[PDB]
Design a protein around this ligand. Structure first.
Ligand SMILES: Nc1ccn([C@@H]2O[C@H](COP(=O)(O)OP(=O)(O)OP(=O)(O)O)[C@@H](O)[C@H]2O)c(=O)n1
Ligand SMILES: Nc1ccn([C@@H]2O[C@H](COP(=O)(O)OP(=O)(O)OP(=O)(O)O)[C@@H](O)[C@H]2O)c(=O)n1
Ligand SMILES: Nc1ccn([C@@H]2O[C@H](COP(=O)(O)OP(=O)(O)OP(=O)(O)O)[C@@H](O)[C@H]2O)c(=O)n1
Ligand SMILES: Nc1ccn([C@@H]2O[C@H](COP(=O)(O)OP(=O)(O)OP(=O)(O)O)[C@@H](O)[C@H]2O)c(=O)n1
Ligand SMILES: Nc1ccn([C@@H]2O[C@H](COP(=O)(O)OP(=O)(O)OP(=O)(O)O)[C@@H](O)[C@H]2O)c(=O)n1
Ligand SMILES: Nc1ccn([C@@H]2O[C@H](COP(=O)(O)OP(=O)(O)OP(=O)(O)O)[C@@H](O)[C@H]2O)c(=O)n1
Ligand SMILES: [Mg+2]
Ligand SMILES: [Mg+2]
Ligand SMILES: [Mg+2]
Ligand SMILES: [Mg+2]
Ligand SMILES: [Mg+2]
Ligand SMILES: [Mg+2]
Lengths: 556, 556, 556
C-alpha cells in the first residue's frame, strides 16, 4: 500500500492537518480509496478525558470511540468513517506494548523502545491502513499519516524512528514524505527567510527521514529565488517546494495544492492507478469554492454559550451551521452569548453584561441551544429557550438544550414548576430528567449512551422526518446518560410539545417538536458529527431554513 | 539533599555501575548516610519477567521486590537494604503517569512528557532519596543516581530532561554530575584518543547537563597531555578528569578513586559534613584489598549447572562463594558442570560430554547445587547429589537443590523410588514435593513465597545454627512455591536426613541436614542475597569451611 | 577587561547590531569607557571592494581604513573613533595566520584552525580591546563584541570556538554573553512562539557558549508566561529574558533596554565601576527621544541619485540630513531622484520617467548632490545643479557633486563649454577635472586621497567657516583622486564662484561657494562620516538651515 507521512519542521502551528487533509482530498478526487491515520504524541489514550476548553471539542466515531477534533477534519475532507484505531497515540502504543509484556508475548526478552515500541507502530500502521474506511469493501490504496509535534521533539522520537524503519518495509515506490516548514518574512525587509527550513530538514535526515515534498508557510506567495535557495539546501526541485500563504478558507487549500501540481508528482513517485483523465470530479469543488467567495446576505442568530469565549468549544457546531448557511446561500453570523449571566443574580450584580447579553439576544432571528455537562450556566440557558418560544423565534435544542426544552415546557406550559433535572437539583420533587445509563453484558456499572444509535420516528407529521428525507428511522451519534424520565411523558400528551423520535428499545425519547411555532425542535444526538460540506445535517439545515424564512418553501 | 547523577557518554559497557557504586562506597566510608537509585530506561516494570540467561539473575529485596542484578551491586558496596522504588524504570514511570491520568489527578489537562513525565521523575527521586536505606532511622545525606543507557539515546531522553530541570530544583551546592566516557587507544600508536569524550559531552550540554566530574576509561593509566586536551574541550581541570584503566577487581575501583582524590572535590562542591579526619575506616578496606592480591591456595569444587555456559546465571552465587573463599583465605575455583548431559540418554548419545562432565565431577572435593525452574536438566542434577552423598563429599543444596536432596534421599535411602516432584512428573504416585503457594487477603490466587521470611530452627544440634551464631531463628530471602509435602515428613524420622528449619506457620520445612557426613545441608531460601564481602553468608561459608576441611576447627 | 559578546540564534536579520550598539550606549552613559569590535565572518579583508548597491555604503575611519557601514553605527551611538582593526573578518584572520606561517612564527609545526586560528582571534580581541577609542588616553573598561552570522553557520565556527576558549582566558567576572533570538507570532493565534529560541540556545551550548542575557524579538511587547516558558528551557530568569518589539526609532532601543533593567544586571555580573548614581546624563537622551516623537513641520528637498532605488546607497547621507533636521526641528523629506533619466536621450525615450523626475525636482526647495564614481548618470546630475543655481535654490555638492559644480560653472558661467572631467570624457580639450592621486614613499603608484586630511580656509568671508565655528581649518574624511585642475583656477577669479578651502600642500582646492545666492557650496570631503546625532555636520546643517530659511538667523 502507498503511504504519505506528513511531518512538521519548525513549529507545531503550521497546519500539518489541513495539508494532510488536503492531500487526502485530492487523491480521493482522483478516484483513489484513501484512508488516513493521525499520530498524537500525547499520553492520553483517548479524547474522553479532555475538558473542551483547553484542548477543544471531543469527536465521536461510529464505533463509539472518543477521539481528537483533528480526526473530524479527515472525516469532513474525505467521505470516510474512521475507527478509533486511526488515532494512534503515545498512550495507546505504550499501553499496548505494556500489555504484551504482561502476557509474555515477548518470550521473556527485555522490551525496549527499539525495536519493540517501533515494531508496535509499524504493525499498527500496516494493520489500520488495511481496514476499509469508505463504504466500499475493498481495501484502501493510499494511507495519509499525519504526525503531530515537530521534528526534534522527544514525544515524536519513537514515531520518526518507526518511520525510518518503515520506509524500508514499505518499498520506496510506496513510501513518501511531506515535510511542512515556515518561510517567515519580517515586516521590514519583507524577505521570505530560509533558515528554519534548512535546520529542520537537517534534523529530519539526522532522524533518518528525507523530504519528498517540502511545504512552505508564508503570509504571501513565494519568490523563485527563495525556492531555489531552499532547493540548494534540500536536494529538491522548486516544483516539490510547495508553498502556502495564509488564505480565506480551508476549502481553498486543496485547490492551491492542485495549482501547485502535486497530483503529477504523486503519479510520478507513487505510480498511482489515477489513469490520467481530462475531467475529474474536482470541477464541482472548484465551483463550490467560487460560490463561497461570492456570498453576500446575512441573518444574525445566536449560539447560547456557557464558557467565556469561543476558541474551539463549538467547532463542529459552527461548521454544521456554516455547511447549512452555504446550502442556504447566506453568510452565517454566530452571536455568541454567555447565558450564565442572563440569570437573575448576575443580572443584578454585573448589569453591564446583563444588558449586553439581552442586546445580543434581541439581534437573534433564531437560536441554537447546544449541549452541556455539570451546572455552569444551567439556570441561564432556560431564558434563551423561553425567549425563543414566547418570541416565536426559530429554535434548535441539542443534547442538554433538548433536556432544557422539556423542563421549560413543563415549568411554563404545564405549570409543573417543581420539575427539574437530576444533574443539577438531584433533590428534585418531580425529577423530569433522570440519569438512565446504558447497561450491557461484559460491562461493569452503567455507561454513557455514546456513539451511533438508531432513533425511530413515532409519526409521519414531523418536520425533522421531512428534512431527513421521509425515512423511517435515522442513525445519529450520542454522548450522554441523562434522559427525560419515561414515566412523566404522560403529562405532555395534552399539550403542544410532542415526542417525534424514540429509541429502538422504546426506553428513551430522543426527538421533540413544538407545534404552532415556525420551527422548534430538540434532539438527544449531536447532528454536527454527521454533517459534511456537500450535504449539511438536516436539523441545522432546518434551523437555517427557518431563520431565513425558507423552510416553508423548502418542503415544497 | 545532595545528589550525584552518574551518566555515560560513548557506550553502555563502560561500567557506570561500578563507578556509581564506588562513589557511594567512599562517601559511606566518610561517615555519610548514602542512598542510591538506579534508572533502567527499559519498559519492564520489574525484574520478575526476565529469564536469567539473556539479562541475568533476578535480585530480591527485603520488601519482596524483584529487581535488576545491578541493584545488588549497590547493596554489596554500601551496607544498605533497598526498597523496590530505588529501581526506577521507564515502565514504572510511564505506568504511574498513566494511572494518574485515569484518576484525573491531571484535572482534565493534556498529559505530556514535559512537564508531566519529567515531574514524575522529579517527585520519585525526591521521595525515594528521603527514605532511610541504612539501619539508622535518620534520612540520607547524599543520593547517588545512576542513569542507564548512553546520552543521545531515545530511552534516556525523559530522564536527562528531568535532571536538567532537577539541577534547578535542587540547588547547585546540592546537585553534581559525573560523566563517564572512553579514551580508546588503538594497538598500533597506543595513543589514548580524545574524540568520543568531546562529542558526548557536547551532546550532554545540548541535553542540558554539564559534567562536574569526567571519568575516563582506558586499558592503561592516563597521560597528562591527553587530560589537558580533554580539559581544553570540556571546561574542566585534569584533577576532575578522573581515569580508569581496567583492573584486577571491583574492590580496587573505590581505592583508585581515592587515589584520584575525589573526596576532596566532593567536600569542595557538595559542602559535605565529612569533618576532615586523618583516619577513616577505609584503612580496613585497604588492608582487605592488599590481602586480596596476596592470595595463593586452591580447592577444585563444582557448581552444578543447567545452562550451557556461565555469563551472569550464577552471579550472586559466585560472589557468595568468593566472599567465603576470601574469609577462608583460599582462591575459589568454580568447576561449572552442565548436569543435563550426565543423565542416561545423553550419557549414551553424546559420550564425549558425558566423560568430560564426570572428569570435572571427579575434580570436586565439594559441590554447590543451586536452584532451578522448569524441567531443564532436572533428571541429571540428582547424580551430583547422589555422588556427593555416596562419595561423602561436602554438599550444599539451594532451593531446587534442597528439593532434589529430599527426593533423592527418599528414592535411594528410603526405597520410595516412586517419589517425585509436582513440577516435573505432575502424574507422580507419591508426590514428595508439591506446589504450596502463599495465600493472603487482598490477593487473588496463590502466589510465590517471595522475599524475606523468618525460618526457625527446630533443634540446637544443627551445624547451620552454629554457623548462624546460635541464634534462635534467621530471616532469609525466598523465591518459590514448591515445598516438600508436609504429610510425607513422617517417613524421614527413622533415617539420617533431618529437618532443622521450619516456617513460623509450621506449614513448610525450610532447612535440612544429613547426619554422619562431613557437611551436607539444603535450604529453601537463597543465602547469596544476604552475603556481604565483609561477612559471608553462613551456608556458603560452611560449605567452603568443609571443602578445605576447616569446618571442625571453625566451630571450636 | 570586561567583555560583552553579542551573538544571534535564529536568523541574521534580528538587528544584533542595534542591540550591541545600544548596550554600548548605556555603558557609556554610565561613565564607562567603552570600546567595540565587530566580527564580519566574510572573506573580504576590507570594505573597499564593495559596490555600494549590494552590501551598501563604504565607511571610512580616521586612520584611512575602509570598513563596513555597521562600524559607523558604533561610531554614532558611542562618541568614539575606531581603528581598522576593530573590524575583524575571516579574511583578516586567515590572512594574518597565513602570513605567520610563511614567516615561520609557527616553528615548522602544522598550522590548524584549532588552536592557531582560534589563538589569532584571541590575541586580536585582547589587543584591540586595549586600544583607546575615546579621546581619553586611558584604556577601555569594557569591550562590546558583535559576532555576525547566526550560530550554527560554518562561517562563525572559528569565532564561537575562540570565544569558548576566551571565556576561560578572561575570567567569568569579565566575560558575558548576550544572545538574540526571535519569538515569532503568527497572525492567527497571535501567540509569541518559543521554539526557535530553544533550539538556537541548545546549539550555542553545543558550541560551548551559554547566554547570560537573552534578547527576544517580536512585533509586540512580551507575555510573562511566554518568558517563563523560555526561562524553563534556558536556565535563566525572565529579567534576563529581555525583549524587543519593533519600534519607531533606533534612538529608542537604548531607552527600551534601560526600561528592561540591563544596567543593574551588568553591575551585578561585571562588577562595574558605575558607582550607582541617581542622575546620569541619559536624562538628555530621554529628552531627545521625547522631542523626536513630537516633531511636526516639513520641507520637500531632493537627493540626486544614480541608482534605481534607495536601500543603503545613501545611508550616512540620510542620517546626516536627519541629524540636521532634528537640530532644525523639522521632519526631513528625502525626494530621491534618478538623474540618469533627466538627461536628453531618456528625456525623449522614456518620457513618463522624465516628467515624473521634473515633478519631483519642482517639489524641492533645496537639493543635496552627493558623490559618485564611473559614468552612470554623470550627464544628468548637472541638470539638478544648473536648476538649483538658476532657480536660486539652496544647494550642497558633495565629492562628485562639487566636481560637477565646478564644471557646470565653467560650462554655463564662463562659456568654457569645452570643459569636462577626466573620468568621463578622457579625450577632453580643456580637462577641468583631472586625476591627481596622492603619492608617498613606501607606496607603489598613485593612490586615492582617502581618510582624514586637513583642509584650510582661504578667507574669513565663508559661510562654511562660520558654520564650522570660525575655526582656521577643519579635518574631514576624503575618498577620491580626481580634483579640479590647479592651472584652470585662474579663469574663476573674475566670476562669482570662489574657492574657500584648500589643502595644506596647496595642491588641491577642496571647498567652493557661490556668492549672491542664498546658500550654494561644494566640498571634496564626505561630511556625513563626521556627523553625530548630538551635533550635525555643519555643511548638512547649513543646507537645512538654508532650505527652511533659518540660515540668516542662525548666523546671528
Ligand atoms: N481538515 C481540516 C483541517 C483544519 N481545519 C481548520 O483549521 C484549524 C486547524 O488547522 P490545522 O490544519 O489543524 O493546523 P493547526 O491546528 O493550526 O496546527 P497543526 O499543524 O498542529 O495542525 C481548525 O480550527 C479547523 O477549523 C479544517 O476545517 N479542516
Ligand atoms: N523538547 C521538547 C519540548 C516540548 N515538547 C512537546 O511540545 C509539545 C507542545 O508543542 P508546541 O506548542 O509546538 O511547543 P511549545 O513548547 O508550546 O512552544 P511554542 O511556544 O513554540 O508553542 C508538548 O506536547 C511537549 O510534549 C517535546 O516533545 N520536546
Ligand atoms: N558494584 C558493583 C558493580 C559491578 N560489579 C561487577 O561488574 C560487572 C558489571 O560492571 P558494571 O560496573 O555494571 O558496568 P557494565 O555492566 O560493564 O556496563 P554499565 O556501564 O552498563 O554498568 C558485574 O559482572 C559485576 O560482577 C560488582 O561486582 N559490583
Ligand atoms: N572541533 C574540532 C577539533 C579538532 N579539529 C581538528 O582536529 C585535527 C586533529 O585530529 P585528531 O588527532 O583526529 O584530533 P585530536 O583532537 O588530536 O583527538 P585525538 O586525541 O582523538 O586524536 C586538527 O587538525 C584540528 O584542526 C577540528 O577540525 N574540529
Ligand atoms: N547602531 C545602529 C544600528 C542600526 N541602525 C539602523 O538599523 C539598520 C540595521 O539594523 P541592525 O541593528 O544592523 O540589524 P540588521 O542589519 O537588520 O541585522 P543584523 O542583526 O545582521 O545587524 C540600519 O539600516 C541602520 O540605519 C542604526 O541606525 N544605528
Ligand atoms: N550552512 C551555512 C549557510 C549559510 N551560511 C552563511 O550565511 C550567510 C547569509 O546569512 P543569511 O542571509 O542569514 O542566510 P541565508 O542563507 O540568506 O538565509 P535567509 O533566507 O534566512 O537569509 C552567508 O554569509 C553564508 O556564509 C553559513 O555560514 N553556513
Ligand atoms: Mg491539527
Ligand atoms: Mg539572507
Ligand atoms: Mg550495570
Ligand atoms: Mg590526535
Ligand atoms: Mg548589522
Ligand atoms: Mg505552544
Amino acid at each position: 500500500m502507498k503511504y504519505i507521512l506528513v511531518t512538521g519542521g519548525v513549529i507545531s502551528g503550521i497546519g500539518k492537518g489541513i495539508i494532510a487533509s488536503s492531500v487526502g482530498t485530492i487523491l480521493k478526487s482522483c478516484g483513489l480509496h484513501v484512508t488516513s491515520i493521525k499520530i498524537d504524541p500525547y499520553i492520553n489514550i483517548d479524547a474522553g478525558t479532555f475538558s473542551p476548553y483547553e484542548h477543544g471539542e471531543v469527536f465521536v466515531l461510529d464505533d463509539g470511540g472518543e477521539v481528537d477534533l483533528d480526526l473530524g477534519n479527515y472525516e469532513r475532507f474525505l467521505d470516510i468513517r474512521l475507527t478509533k484505531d486511526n488515532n494512534l497515540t503515545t498512550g495507546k502504543i505504550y499501553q499496548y506494548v505494556i500489555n504484551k509484556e504482561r502476557k509474555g508475548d515477548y518470550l521473556g526478552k527485555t522490551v525496549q523502545v527499539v525495536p519493540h515500541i517501533t515494531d508496535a507502530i509499524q504493525e499498527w500502521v500496516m494493520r489500520q491502513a488495511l481496514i476499509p474506511v469508505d463504504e466500499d469493501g475493498l481495501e484502501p490504496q493510499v494511507c495519509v499519516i499525519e504526525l503531530g509535534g515537530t521534528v526534534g521533539d522527544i514525544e515524536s522520537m519513537p514515531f520518526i524512528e518507526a518511520f525510518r524503519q518503515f520506509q524500508f518495509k514499505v518499498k520506496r515506490e510506496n513510501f513518501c514524505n511531506i515535510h511542512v516548514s515556515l518561510v517567515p518574512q519580517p515586516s521590514s525587509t519583507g524577505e521570505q527567510k530560509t533558515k528554519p527550513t534548512q535546520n529542520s530538514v537537517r534534523e529530519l535526515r539526522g532522524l533518518g527521514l528525507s523530504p519528498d515534498l517540502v511545504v512552505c508557510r508564508c503570509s504571501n506567495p513565494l519568490d523563485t529565488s527563495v525556492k531555489e535557495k531552499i532547493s540548494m539546501f534540500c536536494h529538491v526541485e522548486p516544483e516539490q517546494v510547495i508553498c502556502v500563504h495564509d488564505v480565506s478558507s480551508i476549502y481553498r487549500v486543496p485547490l492551491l495544492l492542485e495549482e501547485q501540481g502535486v497530483v503529477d508528482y504523486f503519479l510520478r513517485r507513487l505510480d498511482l492507478p489515477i489513469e490520467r483523465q481530462p475531467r475529474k470530479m474536482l470541477m464541482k469543488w472548484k465551483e463550490m469554492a467560487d460560490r463561497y467567495d461570492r456570498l453576500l446576505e446575512t441573518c444574525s442568530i445566536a449560539l447560547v454559550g456557557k464558557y467565556t469565549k469561543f476558541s474551539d468549544s463549538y467547532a463542529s457546531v459552527i461548521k454544521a451551521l456554516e455547511h447549512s448557511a452555504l446550502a442556504i446561500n447566506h453568510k452565517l453570523e454566530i452571536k455568541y452569548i454567555d447565558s450564565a449571566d442572563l440569570e437573575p443574580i448576575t443580572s443584578q450584580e454585573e448589569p453591564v453584561r446583563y444588558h449586553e447579553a439581552w442586546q445580543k439576544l434581541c439581534s437573534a432571528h433564531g437560536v441554537l441551544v447546544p449541549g452541556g455537562f455539570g451546572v455552569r450556566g444551567t439556570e441561564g440557558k432556560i431564558q434563551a429557550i423561553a425567549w425563543a418560544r414566547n418570541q416565536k423565534k426559530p429554535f434548535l435544542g441539542v443534547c442538554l438544550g433538548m433536556q432544557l426544552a422539556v423542563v421549560e415546557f413543563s415549568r411554563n406550559v404545564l405549570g409543573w414548576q417543581d420539575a427539574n433535572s437530576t444533574e443539577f437539583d438531584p433533590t428534585t420533587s418531580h425529577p423530569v430528567v433522570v440519569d438512565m445509563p446504558e447497561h450491557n453484558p461484559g460491562q461493569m456499572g452503567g455507561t454513557m449512551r455514546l456513539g451511533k444509535r438508531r432513533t425511530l420516528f413515532q409519526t409521519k407529521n414531523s418536520v425533522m422526518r421531512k428534512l431527513y428525507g421521509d425515512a423511517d428511522y435515522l442513525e445519529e451519534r450520542h454522548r450522554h446518560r441523562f434522559e427525560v424520565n419515561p414515566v412523566w411523558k404522560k403529562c405532555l400528551e395534552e399539550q403542544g410539545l410532542k415526542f417525534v423520535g424514540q429509541d429502538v428499545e422504546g426506553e428513551r425519547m430522543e426527538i421533540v417538536e413544538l407545534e404552532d411555532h415556525p420551527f422548534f425542535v430538540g434532539v438527544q444526538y449531536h447532528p454536527e458529527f454527521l454533517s459534511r460540506p456537500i450535504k449539511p445535517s438536516p436539523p441545522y439545515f432546518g434551523l437555517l431554513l427557518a431563520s431565513v424564512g425558507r423552510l416553508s418553501h423548502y418542503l415544497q
